[PDB]
RNA sequence: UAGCUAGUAGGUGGGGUAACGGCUCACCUAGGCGACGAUCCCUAGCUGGUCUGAGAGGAUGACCAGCCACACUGGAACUG
RNA sequence: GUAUGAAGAAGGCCUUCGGGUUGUAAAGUACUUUCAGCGGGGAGGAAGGGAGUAAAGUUAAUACCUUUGCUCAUUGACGUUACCCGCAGAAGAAGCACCGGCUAACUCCGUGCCAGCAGCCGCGGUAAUACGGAGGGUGCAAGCGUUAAUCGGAAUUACUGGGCGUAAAGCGCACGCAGGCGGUUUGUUAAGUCAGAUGUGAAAUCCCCGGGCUCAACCUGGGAACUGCAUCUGAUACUGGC
């Protein structure tokens, strides 16, 4: 290659770019939620998926997955969303989380209790 | 010792000054390729024995006006 | 067009020792006879000899080892589009001491070994192994 | 945190004794009568090369009872001073105070020797030491603390240590409960039946 | 003024001092002109636990520089 | 002395007009223990027979290599089409490192002191002959002593 | 992002200022700049460093040091 | 906490039921108490200054101030300090994710193309040890998992260390401005070059080698480098200028 041009314009390569740019370098963000619904999965997986539509304060509007068994969500119910891809959903690169606001407690489990925070018994 | 350069006149359109071009003529530090790298200075001269295309020798001295610090010594090729 | 007098000499050596030639010849110069006297005693050629004085020529007797050339690579590196200068320790190590670098110097054409032994540097001519 | 795993089942698992529940008996040993393979050996699969490394890594760490990040610190300390990562790594584990108390014969197990360090029953240079990770200095004196020098279990560990060979790099007196640590552990008396050609493939990367 | 002072190092409980020539202007831990050695208030088991060039101190006194009482006690700590 | 090694075993499971294959292909190295190295390859129905099919030619295949004091002293490259090898001298108490093929070819040469890397295709049956091409490229100070002068 | 500037380019003189200088007023000559990217926009304080890689390199310059700019917007002068 | 404690108990899990495994674990016994709790004793950070004593201090020997020393009253937010003693008594102190391949740990049950997982593989349509759980196990542990940003794997941006006939691409062809390269011999100047030498290259930080409280964290001495830049005095082959 012409080195007498590399001294003016170097070699350039493709840069890495986010699959979740709407969060803008935050680990989770708040949305009011405009719609809570279900959608049929990608490929022959035959398992109905739970999703919500979220518009963000920065002008983005995206779709999020409702992880953890059991929920109470509606329009204007207010939720937290984070990163993490779902491969069997159309365009769903976001996860909805329930450590904050008004989302109901997850269905209880005896293992892996960090998953959507399985809450300990208390009297 | 003081700093002195050889270069050439590229404009003589003003009376008591000449626009002089100087070069680096050196390798690029990460490519080894020669780079000419021209820079222009607005050099003082009230003698008027030189003009455009003349090869000229200049010296570093004190500022005389805004952004101007270099002055003429001699004509190097003496083509006229 | 015709661009370099040393490529016209190194090609005759490199391709001649690939084609099993006894002795190869090209136009002479002060530099060409200076490097021949290095390549001789460093054991990369078997003889060198000049012919003529007006339009002078140089003939190099090629050297062989175990049915191949005595040389494993003779590389230019210092070329018309890029010349290389090396200082007294900045001199590279060619094939861990199984080869040489050739330096012009202000004090005579020699190896990087002789340049280190003199605390000397200069411009590179070639790297030979 | 503590491992709390089994003492002898692991010795059998790699076919190599860990000086756990086995250092002082030959009869009435309680070692599960040296367990014959039964129908288990016929049903054992081959281990992977990634697993052969891990079997070595865990064995070499657990025989001394040490922390992972400290065992890795010794892998960085064995790389310098022309020490060889395959050679000084063993001597760094062997040179810990918790093993010097063991090689001076004061405890019949490494956990019974580490007990004396962790309960502040040991002193070095006449100063009380509670750090099991301590690297003992050459020509320095290790001794049992005044408030612990009457323990019959230590006199009884020494009653047995008088019947054992000592490391060349240290000495100990069974009366005084005291010994000079002469040198850092040396390859002229340090040997182990471990894969010394395999421990070099660790932490890379 | 230009003064010979102890710069605070060693962090918490066991401080360590670097003896410097510095200007008393503005910043406490500002830039320092020259270092002349180190001082340890804690036992180090070495007879060079504290090191000072008393002739270089005399050279900075030869620049008219100010002395601080803590450095006069350091000159006493090397037994003058 | 024994130096001989097994580099890789590969299970063949495809279906053909003769039925479904249940066979194994092996790759081994041996040498002469005095200055020659070589490799062998072979497929059979049982692994000990595949190892023997390979070993019997690995005991025939030879190339002489310049092995000064059982050590590498210069940087060397080796090539075979899509597979490339690069080997350099290590420091005191350091050595191999690298893929299991290079690890075996150096033991039949008596060598340990090598910093090795592979480039391009990591294919085993090419990277072995590219390593042997890199040993054709290996030089000795004892041979250069017979080249110097005249 | 392809055209930029004409207080701009060169010069001279008055006035002010710690030195120098378009800093400032008035005038004379007619330019100057861009291809090595001026003009325009986006992002960003900079450095010793921080973290990472065998290294070339990559990301990042909080806290701690060595400089900077700023403190509701903008202009201004005075005090030491 | 350390040791010892059985054809191997109570309780579980695997098990045509042979045995296996939890497990020497427990119960039993021995044996030692760190840390903790509480009571007792209690350092160092409190020096520096000040008072007396001494000094032909310097000055004009007892104003200030200085002095190697001696002797004394003094200063604690941290604080129920550090450290040690004493008292029972193993007493008060443990989770997280994973275990079919890459991937170390192994099965058994539930779910049944539904739910639920995933990086690839794809799993699951009622033997998925791939989704939930249990027993055993693996690894790490006051952490462990998850997400975000950005790096190391990456020789896939290219000197170290690639491609353009057919697998990314030689411009359809020629001409050519601006820019780059260019045979030989004898001089000359000494810019580039090479040599010698000095300054500059902060502390901290790193690397390499040491030292300090019982270690490490933390703190700190040494060695090294900062490729260069600035300047001086030489060398003189080759390029540049002549």
Curated annotation (Swiss-Prot), chain A:
Top-level taxonomic group: Bacteria
Something else known: At least 19 substitutions or deletions in 11 codons can promote streptomycin resistance, dependence or pseudodependence; all but one of the streptomycin resistant mutations (K42R) are associated with hyperaccurate translation and thus reduced translational efficiency. The streptomycin sensitive allele is dominant to resistant alleles.
Signal peptide: none
Chain positions found as 3-methylthioaspartic acid: 88
Protein's recorded name: Small ribosomal subunit protein uS12
Gene3D superfamilies: Nucleic acid-binding proteins (2.40.50.140)
PANTHER family in the record: 30S RIBOSOMAL PROTEIN S12 FAMILY MEMBER
Protein's GO biological process: cytoplasmic translation; Group I intron splicing; maintenance of translational fidelity; positive regulation of RNA splicing; response to antibiotic; RNA folding; translation
Assembly behavior: Part of the 30S ribosomal subunit. Contacts proteins S8 and S17. Interacts with ArfA. May interact with IF1 in the 30S initiation complex.
Molecular function via GO: misfolded RNA binding; rRNA binding; structural constituent of ribosome; tRNA binding
Modified residues (N6-acetyllysine): 107
From Swiss-Prot, chain C:
Transmembrane annotation, as ranges: none
Any one of the GO BP annotations: cytoplasmic translation
Pfam families, per the entry: Ribosomal_S8
Keywords from the UniProt entry: Repressor, Ribonucleoprotein, Ribosomal protein, RNA-binding, rRNA-binding, Translation regulation
GO CC term, one of those recorded: cytosol
An example molecular function term from Gene Ontology annotations: structural constituent of ribosome
PROSITE patterns assigned to the protein according to its UniProt record, in alphabetical order: RIBOSOMAL_S8
Description of how the protein assembles with itself and partners: Part of the 30S ribosomal subunit. Contacts proteins S5 and S12.
Similarity comment: family membership: Belongs to the universal ribosomal protein uS8 family.
Name of the protein in its database record: Small ribosomal subunit protein uS8
Native organism: Escherichia coli (strain K12)
Lineage, opening ranks: Bacteria, Pseudomonadati, Pseudomonadota, Gammaproteobacteria, Enterobacterales
UniProtKB/Swiss-Prot annotation, chain D:
Alphabetized UniProt keyword annotations: Antibiotic resistance, Repressor, Ribonucleoprotein, Ribosomal protein, Ribosome biogenesis, RNA-binding, rRNA-binding, Transcription, Transcription antitermination, Transcription regulation, Transcription termination, Translation regulation
Protein's GO biological process: cytoplasmic translation; DNA-templated transcription termination; maintenance of translational fidelity; negative regulation of translational initiation; response to antibiotic; ribosomal small subunit assembly; ribosomal small subunit biogenesis; transcription antitermination
Gene3D superfamilies associated with the record: Ribosomal Protein S4 Delta 41, Chain A, domain 1 (1.10.1050.10), RNA-binding S4 domain (3.10.290.10)
Result when mutating residue 50 to D: In rpsD101; suppresses a temperature-sensitive mutant of release factor 1, R137P. Not a ram mutation
SUPFAM superfamilies, A to Z: Alpha-L RNA-binding motif
GO CC terms: cytoplasm; cytosol; cytosolic small ribosomal subunit; small ribosomal subunit
Pfam families: Ribosomal_S4, S4
Example of a GO MF term: mRNA 5'-UTR binding
Family of this protein: Belongs to the universal ribosomal protein uS4 family.
Annotated function: One of two assembly initiator proteins for the 30S subunit, it binds directly to 16S rRNA where it nucleates assembly of the body of the 30S subunit.
HAMAP family: Ribosomal_uS4_B
Protein name per UniProt: Small ribosomal subunit protein uS4
From Swiss-Prot, chain E:
One GO MF term: DNA endonuclease activity
Keywords associated with the record: Endonuclease, Hydrolase, Nuclease, Ribonucleoprotein, Ribosomal protein
InterPro entries per UniProt: Ribosomal_bS16 (IPR000307), Ribosomal_bS16_CS (IPR020592), Ribosomal_bS16_dom_sf (IPR023803)
GO terms under cellular component: cytoplasm; cytosolic small ribosomal subunit; small ribosomal subunit
One BP term from GO: cytoplasmic translation
Domain of life assignment: Bacteria
Record's keyword annotation contains Mitochondrion: no
Induction notes from the record: Part of the rpsP-rimM-trmD-rplS operon.
Function: In addition to being a ribosomal protein, S16 also has a cation-dependent endonuclease activity.
Family under the similarity heading: Belongs to the bacterial ribosomal protein bS16 family.
NCBIfam families per the UniProt record, alphabetical: S16 (TIGR00002)
Subunit structure: Part of the 30S ribosomal subunit.
Name recorded for this polypeptide: Small ribosomal subunit protein bS16
Species of the source: Escherichia coli (strain K12)
Gene name linked to the record: rpsP
